[PDB]
Amino acid sequence: ISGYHIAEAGANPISQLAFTLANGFTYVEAYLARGMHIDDFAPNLSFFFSNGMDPEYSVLGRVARRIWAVTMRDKYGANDRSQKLKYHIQTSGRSLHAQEIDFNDIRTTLQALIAIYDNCNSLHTNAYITTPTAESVRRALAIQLIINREWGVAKCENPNQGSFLIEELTDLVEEAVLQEFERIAERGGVLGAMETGYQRGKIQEESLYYEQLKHDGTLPIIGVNTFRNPNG
Amino acid sequence: RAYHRRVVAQSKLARERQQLRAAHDMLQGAGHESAALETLASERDVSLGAVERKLLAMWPQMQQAYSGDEYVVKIRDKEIRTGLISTTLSGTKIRKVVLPRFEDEGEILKWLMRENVPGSFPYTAGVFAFKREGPTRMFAGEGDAFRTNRRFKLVSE
Amino acid sequence: RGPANKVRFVTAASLFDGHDASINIMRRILQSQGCEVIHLGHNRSVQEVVTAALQEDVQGIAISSYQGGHVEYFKYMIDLLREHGGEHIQVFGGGGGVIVPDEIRELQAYGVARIYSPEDGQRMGLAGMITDMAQRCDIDLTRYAPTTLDTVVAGDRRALAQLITALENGKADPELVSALHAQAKAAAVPVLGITGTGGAGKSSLTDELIRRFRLDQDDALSIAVISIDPSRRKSGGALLGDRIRMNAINHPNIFMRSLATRESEISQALPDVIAACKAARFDLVIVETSGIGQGDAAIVPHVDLSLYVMTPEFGAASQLEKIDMLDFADFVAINKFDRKGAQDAWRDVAKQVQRNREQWHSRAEDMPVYGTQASRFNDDGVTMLYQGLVGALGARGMSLKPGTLPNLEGRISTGQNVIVPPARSRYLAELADTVRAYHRRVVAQSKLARERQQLRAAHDMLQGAGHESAALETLASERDVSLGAVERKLLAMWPQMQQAYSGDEYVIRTGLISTTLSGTKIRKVVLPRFEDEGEILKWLMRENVPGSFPYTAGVFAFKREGEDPTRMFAGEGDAFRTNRRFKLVSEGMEAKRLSTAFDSVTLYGEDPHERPDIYGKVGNSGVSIATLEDMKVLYDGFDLTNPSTSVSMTINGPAPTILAMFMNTAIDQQIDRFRADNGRDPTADEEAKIRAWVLQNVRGTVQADILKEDQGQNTCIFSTEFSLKVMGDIQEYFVHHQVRNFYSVSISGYHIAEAGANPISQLAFTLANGFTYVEAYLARGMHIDDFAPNLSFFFSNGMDPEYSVLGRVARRIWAVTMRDKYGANDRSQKLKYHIQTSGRSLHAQEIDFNDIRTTLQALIAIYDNCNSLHTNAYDEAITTPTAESVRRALAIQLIINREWGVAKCENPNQGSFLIEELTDLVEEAVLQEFERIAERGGVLGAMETGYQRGKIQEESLYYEQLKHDGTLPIIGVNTFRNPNGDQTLELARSSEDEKQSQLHRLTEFHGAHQADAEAMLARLRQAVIDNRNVFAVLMDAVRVCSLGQITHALFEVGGQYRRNM
Ligand code: B12
Ligand SMILES: CC(C)CC(=O)SCCNC(=O)CCNC(=O)[C@H](O)C(C)(C)COP(=O)(O)OP(=O)(O)OC[C@H]1O[C@@H](n2cnc3c(N)ncnc32)[C@H](O)[C@@H]1OP(=O)(O)O
Ligand SMILES: Nc1nc2c(ncn2[C@@H]2O[C@H](COP(=O)(O)OP(=O)(O)O)[C@@H](O)[C@H]2O)c(=O)[nH]1
Ligand SMILES: C[C@H]1O[C@@H](n2cnc3c(N)ncnc32)[C@H](O)[C@@H]1O
Ligand SMILES: [Mg+2]
Ligand SMILES: [Mg+2]
């Protein structure tokens, strides 16, 4: 189950996380209605998220894990292996720009950081437009190596835990997802919503809103709509 | 949402239960022996769920586990030791998993139900106990099956 | 087994260079491999290093040059060596990424043996370089030794230096040796022996005595100095650390040779070396021994006059009866007379010497026992001892002119200056107690608050069930009184506190909410959701919200709306070019926050000059500022008196002089602004109003932290005590003129850290230095609330875990101590600091990786709510930030501040289990270090031993041992190397025209004030002599005098810094 494309298309972290979990649960309900056992396919379910600059991305993973674990245990009554949501996080490619390509390594670093902080299972790091050169992939691969090996805070495996901001954000994002679950449910489920093009519409709506505030100068992007290259 | 409602209620019970027994010990330390408090406390031992009661019960044992320099856990007939400490250049001990220092059992249970340590339900801080030490996948795909294969064999040499 | 021959080295840092971290760990490996190292320390001209190497007759010279101008520097050295009989001496260099490959090939082609790049260090290893360096210099220099005394007696000082190397190694012909002693006997020159306990001040006192000889006799005397230091027989070599303390030996008539004991406190060939100097027609030979015990006195039979040096600390008075040297010494110098018990120490020693000589018919005060303070410039005590030595040397056949010095009377120095009174000696220890005591209260009050809540909670639950027991309430009300007044109000205001940070605004109105693209409300300050009042109070006392005691999460309520903490360090070329770079950095920002970097020449208070030593360094590591006119140009277009403009100049040694330039500039800008807005010059009264107003509202910061100069950066040019004296003058000037916006000192540790100190050492030393200034000003008679708000701090942020909580720890330690210990007000309890990302953490290999590290470091700085942040460029290891390079650095801050989501919260650190634990640990670690410094006599007492410098250099070695090792992984350096091995990067060097510009501007400035120059400088020296306010005169001095003129004038009256290894 992926949500990389949904976010990349323009969906904000709440929409991405909500839709993706919704899609995942749809597969679960789909396999269950074939008379199958929950402990037979749930451990095989892998997830795939995006990490951008938005605050919600810092707690996206932990929220996904809790919503899954609680539901898989209480609702579907599955075993321990099934309650464990494993996911891959890939840094947002949308968040990187063609103008001042050297700046992208900064953004890709911050995004890679909160992924490791929130104890992800798998991480991809984006390069700083052109072809994937062997030099460009090394700078991307170095971001992970520097954080994992050199970075001091990273030596702790639960640095997020305890933080007032993290716990509040975790609760908020969780509830925001739940409310979106309800919105999809009153549209006939995920399939029923797709029948109306609800998800597509909502993604398209948010993609425009982002692309608007970007041009509006309201959402600052360093090197793009502010602090632009004085040469070109 | 129902799960969270339970966390709130069970925390209140665990909190009240502690507050009562705490006051009970303080009264006996001053001379007054009022078992009227204990009745309300024992009343909340049953009010607390089975799962919730064991969570608080394992908390002191949980603390002693993540306290030392290693993590002893015996699976099958052998055991699996894991290091907890990474020492800085300054000589500071950075624990892999840092536990809360709450006194309130209301906060302890609340934390144990909403965000237990990595490798424990609801796996908020991770699905595994500790991170694996040392995984970089080898991606390739271009041209015909022959070219993609060679790259596969080359990278994975 | 070490080297085959007696291998000797001369190690130093280049002219106007403070980078000793590199060269210090090289002289350590040199010494351990069995080399005698004559270490000269930092800031050494070519004329200095070459003269040293020639007199010591060494095989090798090791120089560190990180300021640039290294091409001209080494070329000069190579040329000068060949010109004066030192072609066979090999020169080695290193400057990290500063010396690019092309310049290495050039310099090595010129004559330099080897210059090691950071890549060389990785391949060869730390020991590998030194092994290569040592094996090259493993040659026998006895072949260059003279066979006849003809050269030496004639006055050849180079032949003398080589003859000594022959005599020391015993490769001199027996018939030549006896012939030397034969002529040495007929020479009849006096030999003064200086001996005494270890670290008493033998070298320092020797240097001072020589200075007295020069001033008194107008440099007419030819003095030979033979200093002996103990040799570690384990390694094979030694650390001859006497020459480094010598500042008055830089003259053609002075000759010095450093000898290792090579065993005894005297070299086995000392009588030969002495005789060699006697035959060289020197007017006087002075010999310094090593650390002698109580019963040691081997210097007596070899000299004509002996001087025993001791400190007031000798234990009981009965100990003096055990000291053999008190029985032979012709003169006894009780040095370090500023120490406690010096007066009583003199009476004991005087009476003991009287007893040993059986002169009962004489007064004890008439004995040749002198109380000296060699650390003190122009000390009357040292002069008294000198006058005595003159009278003794005079009777022993030594022609000397009637002295020009004050022929004073007495035996004891009258230096009554004190920085920190011995009563307050254990101030750091008290501070440690104060903090620990505060935490003990937090624990106890929390327990009470917890119990109080638990009781009343149980009381309400009983009444809800029926059984009412007022017995509980009695215990609760009992704890209402147990709780403090302050603590009770803290919990009382908590529900009101919650309602404040709950809404969308903070009622004067401030927004609390920043809404994401998803529509999530991110609160600026997130409050805890504890139910336990024990946890509430605990949190409110240990880490209250930003803007509340103890200001752990920040000293202010919310971060500034428009003025970001960004403040970019800048400086390149002349004042004109840097003025462009200021406008580049501060472009697009309504608030102009400038940070000025000066070139090595200005940093050391010197004027730009034609000599290659200095010329090549002009404007190459920072802006070259020499006159007030340069300073004016530097900040042209910038309204310094504007409320949204702050200038941060990084200058230490000449800081009072540079500050006076800045102040005059800020004043003159408003005078020009008035003359423009009114079309006329302001009246004497109008100008007075303007001038006074400028001083009050001018906003900025000058570093000037001299305590860190001795410890870390090495930009101290005057004597340590003098620098501190003038620094206080600045603060007193500030108080009088109500300069309440400018920071008189940026108490720093960045420099200490970059030298190699780990985050604990950095934070501890820096706070310790800060508290030292506090104690210094308090003993000096200033209200704590008068100078504490003017105290600025500066830290480093590296990769180490402790750096994440460095700032918050600094804030709490300060706030708690300033409140409980010193009883200061709110403004004083608030520690404001600047954080600059660690430059040493960035490397020359794979420079693109550095932006990753600089990002992470910049992040934790902003998370921990810093007041000011500088971000390093990716080409950090190679050059001063380029135009393209400074934008990438400046973008890191812009991306985090604007784009980064978590950053929308202003206390994201708070709550974290890791952060709170780390905060507690680092805090305690600092407090323990406070105690370690306290039991060494305070910060000053520790510096006297070189404790800080020692601890830094040790930690620097430990890090470096691991960086090359591999135990400490550095991506792109010791692991994950490039299969290629990597082009030409753009560099920030100064134009030739810019150098000639500065020279012409200087000579034009000098010509303009040629009349008032000498007069003003004379006034400046009189200000020091009459002990007035030095800075007050500098406010007028910088208008007619250049930086160099002022600095050199102060040298005649304030002395020069004495290096400390
Ligand atoms: C630490 C440091 C400082 C510390 C110095 C601490 C101390 N007490 O020595 C502090 C903070 C005080 C400092 C201050 C300044 N510095 Co500085 N500093 C650095 C830094 C980060 C590292 C230098 C260092 O000590 N490295 C550790 C050594 C051991 O390793 P290495 O350099 O990689 O060297 C290796 C080999 O080359 C070999 N080698 C090197 N030297 C030698 C010598 C011998 C004999 C041998 C055998 C081998 C050898 O040994 C090493 C093996 O790995 C560099 C940038 C960088 N990372 O390169 C800037 C840098 C050198 N400093 C710089 C400047 C400009 C300054 C200032 C003048 C700034 C100012 N304008 O005020 C000040 C003032 C200095 C002064 N007071 O004279 C610039 C130089 C610019 C230029 N020359 O063009 C640099 C390059 C930073 C920059 N990009 O702007 N500095
Ligand atoms: C050479 C090589 C080795 C490398 C180096 O060493 S580079 C060294 C460079 N050094 C530096 O960059 C040092 C820079 N540091 C400084 O200038 C000072 O230490 C600072 C205190 C950080 C200056 O910070 P600055 O931005 O000027 O802020 P101030 O504290 O002076 O503020 C002035 C007044 O404005 C108000 N204010 C400022 N910020 C806030 C706020 N957030 N909330 C509410 N009110 C605020 C407030 O009234 C304050 O004045 P007070 O009433 O507190 O006296
Ligand atoms: N407090 C104090 N320190 C001094 C005095 N004279 C020298 N020192 C310091 O004592 C230390 C060692 O001095 P040094 O000349 O090397 O002594 P030596 O090794 O025995 O010859 C240095 O830190 C000096 O600055 C003094 O009169 N008072
Ligand atoms: C000691 C630290 O000083 C900084 N530094 C030195 N000179 C400059 C300059 N002109 N501009 C910016 N940073 C500078 C480097 O980042 C180095 O790491
Ligand atoms: Mg000495
Ligand atoms: Mg000595």
Plain-language structure description:
It is classed as isomerase. The entry lists the keywords Radical enzyme, G-protein chaperone. Isobutyryl-CoA mutase fused with bound adenosylcobalamin, GDP, Mg (holo-IcmF/GDP), and substrate isovaleryl-coenzyme A. Chains A, B, C are Isobutyryl-CoA mutase fused. Organism of A, B, C: Ralstonia metallidurans (strain CH34 / ATCC 43123 / DSM 2839). The structure is cut from a larger assembly and holds three copies of chain A. With 232 residues, chain A is mostly helical. The first copy, chain A, has helices at 4-8, 13-32, 38-41, 60-74, 80-83, 104-117, 136-150, 164-185, 189-196, 198-216; strands at 46-51, 86-91, 122-124. In chain A, helix 2 crosses helix 8 (164-185), helix 4 (60-74) packs across helix 8 (164-185) and helix 6 packs parallel to helix 7 (136-150). The longest helix of chain A is centred in the last third of the chain and has 22 residues, at 164-185. Chain A starts with a helix and ends in a 16-residue tail after the last helix. In chain A, 53% of the residues are buried. Chains in contact: A-B, A-C, B-C. Chains A and C meet through helix 2, helix 6, helix 7, helix 8 and helix 10 of A and strand 16, helix 32, helix 33 and helix 34 of C. Residues 569-572, 597, 622, 754, 839, 872, 876, 880-881 of chain C line the site of 5'-deoxyadenosine (5AD).
